[PDB]
Design a protein around this ligand. Structure first.
Ligand SMILES: COc1cc([C@@H](C(=O)N2CCCC[C@H]2C(=O)OCc2scnc2C)C2CCCCC2)cc(OC)c1OC
Length: 128
């Protein structure tokens, strides 16, 4: 399955090189430009616990997810990962709990020490 493929073949886009954030590009985007900190970002995503019952998606509510990149308004893995993406890129991220919700987790949806997997499509990014 997809998490497996990322474990085995995904690249470590973390600074510390601690395999906390692994990424495969599943569909290439357009241009060479990727978003700066503070840029307004527009994405679709599907997320799940790497092995678990909780599953979440923006496609479901058919509204794009919008956040300000690099400000810690999302889990750290997203600030790291989305910054490496180009407009129109779809990527797969596998994320250790240190770059996600840690030991404390976040009920109802996230257990303790949870590894997360996301498919993310980067739709657009605009200047602050
Ligand atoms: C921590 O609680 C939540 C977490 C998420 C998802 C999640 O982890 N997300 C949502 C998309 C951005 C990445 C990450 C996150 O930072 O979510 C919390 C934030 S930060 C601003 N808005 C949200 C929902 C998880 C749900 C279970 C499968 C794995 C992804 C969505 C959630 O509902 C939208 C949510 O509670 C509101």
């Amino acid at each position: 399955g997809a998490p497996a493929t990322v474990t085995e073949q995904g690249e470590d886009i973390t600074s510390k090189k601690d395999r906390g954030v692994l990424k495969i590009v599943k569909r290439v985007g357009n241009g060479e430009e990727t978003p700066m900190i503070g840029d307004k970002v527009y994405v679709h995503y599907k997320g799940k616990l790497s092995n678990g019952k909780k599953f979440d998606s923006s496609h479901d509510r058919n509204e794009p997810f919008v956040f300000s990149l690099g400000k810690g308004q999302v889990i750290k893995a997203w600030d790291i990962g989305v910054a490496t993406m180009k407009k129109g890129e779809i990527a797969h991220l596998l994320i250790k709990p240190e770059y996600a919700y840690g030991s404390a987790g976040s009920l109802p949806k996230i257990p303790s020490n949870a590894t997360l997997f996301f498919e993310i499509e980067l739709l657009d990014f605009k200047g602050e």
